[PDB]
Amino acid sequence: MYNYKEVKHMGYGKGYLAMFKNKKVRFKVVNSFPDLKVQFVTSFPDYKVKISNSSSFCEETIKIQVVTSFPDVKLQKVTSFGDFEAYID
């Protein structure tokens, strides 16, 4: 999505999510031409995310799409004690 840095690069990965590690972010779950496929689990896969009910605070927004198999990046939605904060649609 839009930002201060050049958005010439395409395809986001794990490192991309680390860009805002220990910071706040926004997530937008879509059902078409998504940005990244991230599956949600009950445990802590690779990274942890904290689900919040707020929009006027996020620094950036990224489109995502929950999959059933062959997920791009797994995240753990918790209320606290997580890695970073992200508000998914």
Burial of 16: CB neighbours in 10 Å, binned 0-12, 13-18, 19+:
middle
Contact 40, 68 (CB under 8 A): no
Is 26 within 8 Å of 61 (Cβ atoms)? yes
- What residue ranges in 5-72 does DSSP mark as E strands? 24-29, 38-41, 47-50, 61-64
Which of helix, strand or coil describes residue 20? Answer: coil
In whole angstroms, give the CA distance from residue 64 to residue 28: 6
Residue pair 84/21 in contact by the 8 Å Cβ criterion: yes
Report the C-alpha gap between 58 and 77 in whole angstroms.
16
For the chain, count helices (H), then strands (E): 1, 6
Residue 15 belongs to what H/E stretch? Answer: helix 14-18
